[PDB]
């Protein structure tokens, strides 16, 4: 009943109040999964030696 | 340096099982055996590509030490030593040693090559073709996959 003539929450007679502190929300990585296809792109490398090969 | 070729043909052969060995570690005790078997047929059989590889490339290798041979040149005739010198000694010294390092480095490029190589089909493949068969028989077929077309590589004789 206090709520619609716009009475704060504090101005009704409560049961009590609780305090929470949890700082530190959600903690990690965004993709724990597709950076491990990126391995793939060290063959990249020896990719570029063999088209240097076919080159000198 | 026949040993060491062993050695390294080997432990290459054998760090696929060093990365397998904790990583599902089922029946250590009746595996070992698979394990040893399949390193040691993964070794001859990468020894035999690498023998392969170094014979074919050689042909290249051999101008591509050229630049060093003549830097090694420019230092064994400055010098008062060969003034007087056999004048062809030095080039036989030099052109061994050369051939020395190439070898070396010539054997170096191929087995991490095959190495790196060794390593990007069998990720893949565990991580796919193991929704229809048997994981153990998955990593068995990948690794003789593996080995094999590391062995073909070298000939090509297709």
Same mark, same amino acid.
């Given at each position: 009943?206090?709520?619609?003539?716009?009475?704060?929450?504090?101005?009704?007679?409560?049961?009590?109040?609780?305090?929470?502190?949890?700082?530190?929300?959600?903690?990690?990585?965004?993709?724990?999964?597709?950076?491990?296809?990126?391995?793939?792109?060290?063959?990249?490398?020896?990719?570029?030696?063999?088209?240097?090969?076919?080159?000198? | 340096?026949?040993?060491?070729?062993?050695?390294?043909?080997?432990?290459?052969?054998?760090?696929?099982?060093?990365?397998?060995?904790?990583?599902?570690?089922?029946?250590?005790?009746?595996?070992?055996?698979?394990?040893?078997?399949?390193?040691?047929?993964?070794?001859?059989?990468?020894?035999?590509?690498?023998?392969?590889?170094?014979?074919?490339? &050689?042909?290249?290798?051999?101008? *591509?030490? %050229?630049?060093?041979?003549? !830097?090694?040149?420019?230092?064994?005739?400055? =010098? $008062?030593?060969?003034? &007087?010198?056999?004048?062809?000694? *030095?080039? %036989?010294?030099?052109?061994? !040693?050369?051939?020395?390092?190439?070898?070396? =480095? $010539?054997?170096?490029?191929?087995?991490?090559?095959?190495?790196?190589?060794?390593?990007?089909?069998?990720?893949?493949?565990?991580?796919?073709?193991?929704?229809?068969?048997?994981?153990?028989?998955?990593?068995?077929?990948?690794?003789?996959?593996?080995?094999?077309?590391?062995?073909?590589?070298?000939?090509?004789?297709?």
């Amino acid at each position: 009943k206090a709520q619609r003539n716009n009475e704060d929450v504090s101005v009704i007679p409560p049961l009590f109040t609780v305090s929470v502190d949890h700082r530190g929300t959600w903690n990690p990585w965004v993709s724990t999964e597709v950076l491990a296809a990126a391995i793939g792109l060290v063959i990249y490398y020896l990719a570029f030696s063999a088209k240097s090969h076919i080159q000198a | 340096s026949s040993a060491l070729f062993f050695g390294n043909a080997f432990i290459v052969s054998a760090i696929p099982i060093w990365l397998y060995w904790r990583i599902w570690h089922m029946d250590l005790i009746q595996s070992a055996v698979l394990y040893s078997v399949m390193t040691l047929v993964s070794t001859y059989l990468v020894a035999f590509a690498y023998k392969n590889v170094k014979f074919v490339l &050689k042909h290249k290798v051999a101008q *591509k030490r %050229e630049d060093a041979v003549s !830097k090694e040149v420019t230092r064994k005739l400055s =010098e $008062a030593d060969n003034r &007087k010198m056999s004048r062809k000694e *030095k080039d %036989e010294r030099i052109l061994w !040693k050369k051939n020395e390092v190439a070898d070396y =480095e $010539a054997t170096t490029f191929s087995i991490f090559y095959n190495n790196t190589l060794f390593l990007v089909l069998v990720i893949v493949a565990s991580f796919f073709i193991l929704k229809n068969f048997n994981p153990t028989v998955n990593y068995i077929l990948s690794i003789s996959a593996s080995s094999g077309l590391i062995a073909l590589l070298s000939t090509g004789s297709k």
